[PDB]
Amino acid sequence: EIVLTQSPGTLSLSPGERATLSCRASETVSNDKVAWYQQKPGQAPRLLIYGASSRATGIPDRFSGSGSGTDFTLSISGLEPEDFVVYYCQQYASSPRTFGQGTKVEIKRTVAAPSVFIFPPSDEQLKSGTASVVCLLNNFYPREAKVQWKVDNALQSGNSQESVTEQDSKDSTYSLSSTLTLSKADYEKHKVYACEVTHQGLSSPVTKSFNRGEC
Amino acid sequence: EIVLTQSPGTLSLSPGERATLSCRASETVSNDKVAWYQQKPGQAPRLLIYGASSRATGIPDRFSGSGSGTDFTLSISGLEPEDFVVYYCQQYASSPRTFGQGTKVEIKRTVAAPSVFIFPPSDEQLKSGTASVVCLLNNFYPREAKVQWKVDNALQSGNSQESVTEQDSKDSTYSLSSTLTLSKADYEKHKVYACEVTHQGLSSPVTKSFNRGEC
Amino acid sequence: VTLKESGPTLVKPTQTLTLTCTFSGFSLTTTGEGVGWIRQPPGKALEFLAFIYWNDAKRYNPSLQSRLTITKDASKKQVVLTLTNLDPVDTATYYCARTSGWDIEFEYWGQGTLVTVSSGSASAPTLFPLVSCENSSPSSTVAVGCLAQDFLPDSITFSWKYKNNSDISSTRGFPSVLRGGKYAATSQVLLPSKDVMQGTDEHVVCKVQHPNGNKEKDVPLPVVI
Amino acid sequence: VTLKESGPTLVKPTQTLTLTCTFSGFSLTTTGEGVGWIRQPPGKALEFLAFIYWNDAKRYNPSLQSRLTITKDASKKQVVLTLTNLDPVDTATYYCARTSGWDIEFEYWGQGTLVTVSSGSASAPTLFPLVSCENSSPSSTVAVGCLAQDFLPDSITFSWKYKNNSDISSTRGFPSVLRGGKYAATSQVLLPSKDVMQGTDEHVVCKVQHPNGNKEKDVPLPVVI
Amino acid sequence: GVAEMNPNVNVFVPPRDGFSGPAPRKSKLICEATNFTPKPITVSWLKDGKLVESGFTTDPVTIETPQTYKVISTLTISEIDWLNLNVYTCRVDHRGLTFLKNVSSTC
Amino acid sequence: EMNPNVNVFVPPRDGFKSKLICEATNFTPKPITVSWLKDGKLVESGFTTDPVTIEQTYKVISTLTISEIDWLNLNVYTCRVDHRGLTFLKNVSSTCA
Ligand SMILES: *[C@@H]1O[C@H](CO)[C@@H](O[C@@H]2O[C@H](CO)[C@@H](O)[C@H](O)[C@H]2NC(C)=O)[C@H](O)[C@H]1NC(C)=O
């Protein structure tokens, strides 16, 4: 049983700089039998370098793999725009094989101001007995953001999800979706529904509130 | 006779990165007797490292000096904001001593859009028999810029100077002054006076023209 | 060298799951060749399940010991993977690759199939209108969303159209999220306010496609002006 | 260990230049100690002129051979530097330092003095108005300049004041430039377009200070409104 | 940072049927000036020698060879005060000059 | 949706080419069409339309170039305003006539 941890979990790079990826192992590996893989979000994974010594067929020479023992650094020169994917390191000398966590890279973009648009539920959804309030944010950077709900001066937790999209090809931004689900009985007792956004580019949190049945 | 050339003549750095300075020599130096000096634009120069081996008294340990023969690289870690000055390398093993050119560093700032304002000469200056037209630019980056005069579809050269200021402490910009001097007889024959500015951040040259005695 | 995966996509937890890793172009007669199974949950990393070598020698993961079975076959050129004691939290896309040599591991990957482990059946997606309340400062643009809930699996692509049978560049689309066993999707569009206060279109349609029912429902536009 | 330089600041070309590098706190009795001369034109790098060692041993620059003389003195604790055959293009600020050991060279620098080599005399700075002409696009901010010509040396600090005896943040200041022997300077100031159109001031003053005459002249301010 | 002109005072008054709304009816008064540069005019309303300090809204000066400008003002009045033959004067201050325009409803 | 308040101003009795202003404040939505007439006949040129401002309500005004001779001869200048399909008319004349 060998546990592989790849730190840090994310890193911002540039189109034409060096991207160093670490692969920490719990123990040593015999004969340095550690391999790297490349997986695209939507396609099948592929093998780049086997054994961290020699490259495979169909892999450009710009991928360099070195390191031995418990340290394996994957240095890449000339990061192409079509290489912003998540890489993994896998070893096959543990009987059986184990995988790691993975590192996600992105394009270093300037910090912008997200535009939050909260959509109150319609009257047709309330007929089924379930209500949901969404908190959609667009054009923000980086992915790290805090979304909190403040209804009747109370913080709700344990019943809200956080789903974010991938990086845009033409905008290099992200878009998260925060839906606050609740019951029909719990929706007719409160008055104001809003979500708080804490962004690095904003010096003060912006709250978008509305009125129950008055908009 | 040893000629010392420091290339490149300028380089853009960041507050907290590594700044590498080169010192090319025509021939070898005996016992590596090459020293570095720090001079501030307005104060007296000071000696940082003597002989490129040991540091002097009152110099922080963040200054590292290595290299031998015809190569001397001055690596500095943690570039403080109060260190954006011009450095020089001087050797004292040539009988007599010689100096170099020097390298000027600056803060890497985003390219802005300068606004050129041309000031036509007043009527009091024309009474003395001499006229001067200035071409002032503000908030432009980098220092490299082209200023040309186009009067009556003719380019004037060999009679205009170019003087630029230093880097601002709060703005990190520059300001140049291009004065076009001429005689009284050469000012009453032309009609339109303007200067052409070619900036990296501008997609088209902007010309500010006026009328003789109609403004 | 190519591989292809096939099998059921909608299965019930705690029953029987079977997948086939069909391959053609090679045989398991040499040494250092084996086929494994790798799965990845939608939001997690790759996970190892089992691996089988040649000469009738297979290994199993100690974490999932005595829970998986490997049955190879030299006649149909495929391996049958039987998965018992299913768990909805173990929903992941399984993959299989072929190894050529001791040093080279998992070189020729396959395609993979999406298998959803849930107690619910295939139900038509339910669309609900989303009224936009943009008061005070309308900023620059006003957006309108089309809520999608109670759909299985996640095979719905949003498509916004105008009232006069035109095309709207959606581009922005959020993925689905597990909602008590089912999935919920949300998608909006950045419509300029100039075309809303001037045009006579009071509502837009939300047309989506799904292999379990083509449901559609227009959404109202309260506008701001 | 401190050093101080003194001497004339306005000299004529092709005559006689004399500077004194006054020092106090050490003596030239040990070995490896010497005082040199370093000059830097306003726009160029450091230039070596001469150096003198102990035990009555001095060297000269081959580029300026048979043109400089070094005369030390152990009584006045100063070195006299005589510069013959002056040249206006050789105008630079001279410096002198003290060396402590063979490895350490030019450790304790002095202060330095500005010596201008020009045929002209000390004349009062002639100020001329600079009327701004910004047509077509008003843009956002408009600046006003104050021309300064025929002044020697460059020891003028510009200052802008309102009509009601107030203070204006000039900040921006351009250095002087050689104009046929003399110097010419220009200074502008960024004035907001809101304060100019609000006040009733019709002109502003350009007050400068110079040790050869305090001259001032107001420039026209036609205002915008 | 050379055209000096004088403003032209133009005062608009409601017609005999320009009053509407619940009793008492109210109307508006507009004092505009065009073809003048610069624009130091400050909007001031005088009602029979009394300075009006409430009920007026000074709109920002817009933009219409000298550069001319135009300023539009609005003052809220009452029908009762209009029936008492009250003279309204639009005070204009242009470079210290005082411009007056006395208007009424007398035929 | 509210009906705009059409108000047409007239030149003073004691003299002043004057201008006609047809205010339509307190109206919704923002789009609005304002035209001018002359004795029941369409007007081709001779008038402008100022940009709509913000006083949520807005403010729209129109300027018509007239003459003193053509104003004191019993001429009606109706300010036709079409708002949400409703045509608003306001006939004005000389007060002292
Ligand atoms: C359907 O109606 C819309 C109005 O909302 C039309 O959009 C206008 O037409 C141009 C050209 O097609 C668009 O680019 C603009 O968004 C709209 N114009 C303006 C001035 O806002 C749209 O064209 C109509 N569809 C078809 C096929 O005619």
Ligand SMILES: *[C@@H]1O[C@H](CO)[C@@H](O[C@@H]2O[C@H](CO)[C@@H](O)[C@H](O)[C@H]2NC(C)=O)[C@H](O)[C@H]1NC(C)=O
């Ligand atoms: C001198 O006159 C100027 C007018 O140009 C005054 O500047 C105005 O007053 C305020 C308060 O001092 C300034 O901050 C602004 O620059 C001006 N106001 C506006 C609205 O533009 C200045 O204050 C006067 N000096 C003194 C001492 O009163």
